[PDB]
RNA sequence: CCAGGGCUACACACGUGCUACAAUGGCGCAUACAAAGAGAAGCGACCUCGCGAGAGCAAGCGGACCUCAUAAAGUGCGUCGUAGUCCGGAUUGGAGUCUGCAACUCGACUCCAUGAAGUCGGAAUCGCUAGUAAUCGUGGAUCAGAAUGCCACGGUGAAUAC
RNA sequence: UCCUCCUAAAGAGUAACGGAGGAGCACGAAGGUUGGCUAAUCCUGGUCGGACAUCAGGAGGUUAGUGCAAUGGCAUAAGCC
């Protein structure tokens, strides 16, 4: 429902995980780009998204491509 | 009885090559189909069971038998010998026409149809299925009826095991999703 | 069967949308015209459209297009 | 007049009466009669059987009541088992599109029981 | 100073508003009558494409000339014929367009589909005596995008005050 | 006042302010005859239906029932139609 021309990602997150695929499934990427859309070329990684005070580890599967990284990081807790 | 003639010629010889029987009648055969419809809500309105009698009389070819309460259980406020449901046991040539009108023109008329379960077996060869709506049979006019009448159909066969009974039932074109 | 306690059991003539006529005995009425029958129902093909409903990376390549 | 889903209406204009089927509203109903050559202002009972079947498959060209309910259910269930923010609002019956949950959102959350 | 999050969070209570519960009404076609304003790192005609939000191209105008901008209630015909119904639009699913580095938390708008509560509202309480109430439409400030709020403009236009 | 068990010592009978329960009705069918049928409780499957309604199959055997407190008895059924 936004950005018809090209899914969005940052240079700092795109250049990090493209460097991560040839090095195997190494350490989780500590990133702040909640706005970055997910591509099929990050599936399998445990990249951690900053929800505001911690970086929650999320396991990306195949289906989660249209969603962004900030979908899976609960910023506001409730009871 | 189209399926009974289909059974006596095609199905019986098909089942001889599945369990390598030595006698012709070691094969399973269907014994009865009991059209039970346990209304249950007739403790308050007695004529609901009277209207329930017309439903099984229209789906089948005979008037149903109004069942009586076997015990007096406080969980449902029923006493001894209270009319609570109705049943239709179809036997002879007449059940094959209902067996034809069920698997051919009534199974497609099941809403949100996906198929039948192959695990709905008692363990001897007696399949049992329960429909939620009566508008799968074209006898019901769907308008002058007031309460949605669902019912359950069990098919008692002479099979020794439920796997053997399913093999006999698989020759009668069942979905078995 | 007991006489005159069961309804009329007149044989009728039914037919689905595809024209598959069959003769059956029931309590419908004069005749019958159906919309679907077991020899034309999409149950051997309706189970094909229920399991092949998944997929997201193929849809994601319909937006990136490269 | 027993087309795809259930759809037995009577004494109603066709394009309005086709809205009863789950999966077709006002606009798609006008697309059914336009491809079937059916007059919009004429009731169903006046239409013959030879025109009922030519719109039975025309409705079948669009996803309808039978397989749409599970299609909607799996799209929601995909979000519910995902852990995303779209699923958590479906998990608690809360609005998913970011509405005024503080005072409003009675319809999504439910009737006020206390 | 910086990145992310919060200011939008939710068993709840209250205030102020918009839309409804319909037939003096809805829907479809045709059609008449305004005022006030705003415009350039903008208003953006005409034409083409797209069901549509909108996209391409793009004159004219820092302005009684050009654009926003076709005013709407109103009129004629057809239909619906009193039902939770063609009333009502929340909610949700899929697909999209614009803005902005970026629309997930939390923007607006559009297409299809789903279709809620609501059938005129208790005690109580509010505003109004005229071109006011009541109703309909329009414009502006804010503003990259983003109001049912605020300010302002006109159309139809009551009853009653012993 | 009457009925059932024990007390009560294997015929009968046998006391206590002994241990334990009921009755002072009911039924014109719950009687007679004929004919037919026989349960409870579990396991599995099956719309509502869920421990428990109703249905189908299997085990099981009278642990069921006998209008009523208990004893004795009952399928040749005294049990059910």
Please name which of D34, D38, D44 lies closest in space to residue D3, comparing C-alpha atoms: D44
Contact A66, A37 (CB under 8 A): yes
DSSP state of A72: G
**Residue entry with tokens 């008329």:** B109
**Residue entry with tokens 């998204």:** A49
Contact B123, B157 (CB under 8 A): no
**What residues contact B158, with CB distance under 8 A and at least 6 apart?**
B28, B29, B30, B31, B125
**Residue entry with tokens 């008037």:** B63
- Distance, in Å, from the CA atom of D18 to the CA atom of A44, rounded to the nearest integer, reads 47
Neighbours of D69 (CB within 10 A): 13
How far is CA A58 from each of CA A71, B88, C51, D78, D79, rounded to the nearest angstrom? 10, 58, 27, 16, 15
**Phi, psi for D103 (deg, rounded to 5):** -115, -50
**What residues contact D21, with CB distance under 8 A and at least 6 apart?**
D3, D4, D5, D6, D7, D59, D64, D65
Nearest CB to C64: which of A7, A62, A64? A7
**What residues contact D61, with CB distance under 8 A and at least 6 apart?**
none
- Distance, in Å, from the CA atom of D26 to the CA atom of D19, rounded to the nearest integer, reads 6
Strands C21-25, B127-131: pairing kind: unpaired
Question: Residue D85: in which H helix or E strand, if any?
Answer: helix D85-92
Q: Angle at CA B143, nearest 5°, toward D20 and B151? A: 100
**What residues contact A78, with CB distance under 8 A and at least 6 apart?**
none
For residue B64 the two structure tokens come to: 């149903």
**Chain D closest-CA separation from residue C29 CA (Å):** 17
Please say whether the dihedral angle defined by the alpha carbons of residues C36, C37, C40 and C46, taken in this order, is positive or negative.
Answer: positive
Nearest CB to D53: which of C17, C49, C53? C17
Which nt has its C1' nearest the CA of D108?
E91
Please name which of B98, B83, B82 lies closest in space to residue B34, comparing C-alpha atoms: B98
Neighbours of D59 (CB within 10 A): 21
Taking phi over 0 as left and psi of -120 to 50 as alpha, with beta for the rest, D82 belongs to alpha
DSSP state of A25: S
SS3 A58: coil
- Distance, in Å, from the CA atom of D80 to the CA atom of D74, rounded to the nearest integer, reads 9
Residue of D nearest to C53 (CA): D71
**Phi, psi for A40 (deg, rounded to 5):** -65, -10
Please name which of A60, A66, A63, A65 lies closest in space to residue A48, comparing C-alpha atoms: A60
Taking phi over 0 as left and psi of -120 to 50 as alpha, with beta for the rest, C60 belongs to alpha
Q: Method of determination?
A: cryo-EM
DSSP string of chain C? --TTSS----EEEEE-TT--EEEEE-SS-S----S--TTTSTTSSTTHHHHTT--SHHHHHHHH--
Contact C23, C33 (CB under 8 A): no
Q: Any bridge partners for residue B87, and if so which?
A: B36, B65
Taking phi over 0 as left and psi of -120 to 50 as alpha, with beta for the rest, D13 belongs to beta
Verify if strand F has an atom below 7 Å from the CB of B132.
Answer: yes
Nearest CB to A7: which of C54, C57, C63? C63
Question: Which chain C residues are Cβ-neighbours of B104 within 8 angstroms?
Answer: 22, 37-39
Contact B8, B55 (CB under 8 A): no
Contact B95, B33 (CB under 8 A): yes
For residue A18 the two structure tokens come to: 């493209």
**What residues contact A66, with CB distance under 8 A and at least 6 apart?**
A37, C56, C59, C60
Interchain contact C66–A (C-beta under 8 A): no
Question: Which chain A residues are Cβ-neighbours of C64 within 8 angstroms?
Answer: 6-7
Report the CATH superfamily, name and number, of domain B1-177: Ribosomal protein L5 (3.30.1440.10)
DSSP string of B59-128? HSSSPPEEEE-SS--TTTT--TT-EEEEEEEE-TTHHHHHHHHHHTTTSTTSTT-----TT-B-SSS-EE
**Phi, psi for B115 (deg, rounded to 5):** 140, 170
- Distance, in Å, from the CA atom of D65 to the CA atom of D24, rounded to the nearest integer, reads 9
Please name which of B145, B159, B158, B166 lies closest in space to residue B91, comparing C-alpha atoms: B158
Length of chain D: 114
Q: Any bridge partners for residue A48, and if so which?
A: A30, A57
Strands A30-31, C21-25: pairing kind: unpaired
Interchain contact B58–C (C-beta under 8 A): yes
**What residues contact C47, with CB distance under 8 A and at least 6 apart?**
B114, B115, B177
- Distance, in Å, from the CA atom of D75 to the CA atom of D67, rounded to the nearest integer, reads 12
Please say whether the dihedral angle defined by the alpha carbons of residues B12, B18, B22 and B27, taken in this order, is positive or negative.
Answer: negative
Contact A48, A29 (CB under 8 A): yes
């Amino acid at each position: 429902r936004s950005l018809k021309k090209g899914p969005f990602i940052d240079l700092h997150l795109l250049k990090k995980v493209e460097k991560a695929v040839e090095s195997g499934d190494k350490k989780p990427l500590r990133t702040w780009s909640r706005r970055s859309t997910i591509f099929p070329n990050m599936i399998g990684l445990t990249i951690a998204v900053h929800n505001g005070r911690q970086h929650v580890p999320v396991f990306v599967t195949d289906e989660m491509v249209g969603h962004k990284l900030g979908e899976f990081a609960p910023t506001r807790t409730y009871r | 009885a189209k399926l009974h003639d289909y059974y006596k010629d095609e199905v019986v010889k098909k089942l001889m090559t599945e369990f390598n029987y030595n006698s012709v009648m070691q094969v399973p055969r269907v014994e009865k189909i009991t059209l039970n419809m346990g209304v249950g809500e007739a403790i308050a309105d007695k004529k609901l069971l009277d209207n329930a009698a017309a439903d099984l009389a229209a789906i089948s070819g005979q008037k149903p038998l109004i069942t009586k309460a076997r015990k007096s259980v406080a969980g449902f406020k029923i006493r001894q010998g209270y009319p609570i449901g109705c049943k239709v046991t179809l036997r002879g040539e007449r059940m094959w026409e209902f067996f034809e009108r069920l698997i051919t023109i009534a199974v497609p008329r099941i809403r949100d149809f996906r198929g039948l379960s192959a695990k709905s077996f008692d363990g001897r060869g007696n399949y049992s299925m329960g429909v939620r709506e009566q508008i799968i049979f074209p006898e019901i006019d769907y308008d002058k009826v007031d309460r949605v009448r669902g019912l359950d159909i069990t098919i008692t066969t002479t099979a020794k095991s439920d796997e053997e009974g399913r093999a006999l039932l698989a020759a009668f074109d069942f979905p078995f999703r | 069967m007991k006489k005159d306690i069961h309804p009329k059991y007149e044989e009728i003539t039914a037919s689905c949308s595809c024209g598959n006529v069959m003769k059956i005995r029931s309590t419908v009425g004069h005749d019958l015209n159906l919309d679907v029958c077991s020899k034309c129902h999409p149950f051997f093909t309706g189970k094909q459209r229920d399991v092949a409903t998944g997929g997201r990376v193929d849809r994601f390549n319909k937006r990136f297009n490269i | 007049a027993r087309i795809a889903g259930i759809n037995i209406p009577d004494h109603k204009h066709a394009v309005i009466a086709l809205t009863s089927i789950y999966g077709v509203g006002k606009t798609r109903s006008k697309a059914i009669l336009a491809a079937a050559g059916i007059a919009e202002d004429v009731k169903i009972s006046e239409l013959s059987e030879g025109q009922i079947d030519t719109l039975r498959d025309e409705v079948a060209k669009f996803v309808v009541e039978g397989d749409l309910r599970r299609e909607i259910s799996m799209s929601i269930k995909r979000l519910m088992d995902l852990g995303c923010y779209r699923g958590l609002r479906h998990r608690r019956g809360l609005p998913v599109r970011g509405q005024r949950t503080k005072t409003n959102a009675r319809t999504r959350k439910g009737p006020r029981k206390p």
